[PDB]
């Protein structure tokens, strides 16, 4: 069901990061009516910037659009559960909800954490496609 | 005693952030022989970038200098105890030691946290000067 079109776009965009050896992650920020306002992909290693995960990129995008650091009436949708750096960045701009498709433990160590709802997206098919994408990425990099 | 000259430089540099309404924070990264390799100040609101705290700025500086994300044989010296976003960024580049002059609770909420030593700098005089700086900043902004 949920976010089928949005997840289609995010999954398709996350592939663009594989060129530059970045983990394929993409995310967007939506308003109360599920309109996408900002879209971003992971570009840390592409631009040699420790901060340029997809989450911080989309946050900075909406900040530039609104000329405001208060993003409290928007929500974030990401393909992969954010890291603690990006999690803290999300809480500092006052976004109260993170929808994620794949949790942080399927490919790594679980994150340890009130003011922020962390919701798993129910869409086994999109989740399966994206997990396939990540598996291919990691095994092709171990090469 | 400790880091008297380095703290003099950091405190003097942190003043440059007050122009652009940024919290006066400055930091550097040193090697095993206490040579400064990278120096940075806080510029979040100056450049509308949620990530541009002084810690992430100095990390990105050293990354550009070394063309490497492995900073495990360097340590970080900051005037103010880092936030959790910057803390996670520091741990992700594998810096194992953070020297801080003023802890996070004197002006805010205490941070809640192994692989990372968090050391308070013993220098009551520099600490007093910097605390004075921060007090003047915050009260002048409440205006
Ligand atoms: Zn992240
Ligand atoms: Zn910070």
The alpha carbon of A5 and the centre of ligand 2 are apart by a number of angstroms equal to 35
C-alpha distances out from residue B91 to A20, A50, A73, A84, B17, Å: 23, 11, 31, 10, 25
φ, ψ (nearest 5 deg) of residue A20 = -100, 25
Under 8 Å CB pairs connecting chains A and B tally to 58
Domain ranges of chain B: 1-143
Contact status of B84 with chain A (Cβ, < 8 Å): yes
According to the 3-state scheme, what is the secondary structure of A10-67?
HHHHHHHHHHHCCCCCEEEEECCCCCEEEEEECCHHHHCCCCCCHHHHHHHHHHHHHC
Contact status of B29 with chain A (Cβ, < 8 Å): no
Instruction: State the resolution, in angstroms.
Output: 2.4
**Rounded Cα gap, residues B133 and B113, in angstroms:** 27
List the structure tokens of A127.
């989740």
Contact status of A140 with chain B (Cβ, < 8 Å): no
**Rounded Cα gap, residues B141 and B136, in angstroms:** 8
């Amino acid at each position: 069901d949920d976010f089928n079109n949005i997840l289609d776009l995010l999954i398709n965009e996350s592939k663009k990061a594989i060129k530059h050896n970045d983990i394929p992650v993409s995310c967007c920020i939506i308003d109360s009516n599920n309109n996408i306002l900002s879209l971003a992909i992971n570009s840390r290693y592409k631009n040699k910037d420790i901060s340029q995960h997809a989450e911080i990129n989309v946050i900075n995008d909406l900040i530039s659009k609104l000329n405001s650091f208060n993003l409290s009436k928007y929500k974030l949708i990401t393909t992969l559960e954010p890291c603690m750096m990006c999690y803290s960045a999300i809480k500092q701009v006052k976004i109260n909800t993170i929808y994620y498709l794949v949790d942080s433990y399927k490919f790594g160590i679980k994150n340890n954490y009130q003011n922020l709802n962390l919701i798993q997206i129910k869409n086994q098919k999109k989740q399966s496609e994206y997990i396939k994408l990540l598996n291919i990425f990691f095994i092709n990099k171990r090469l």
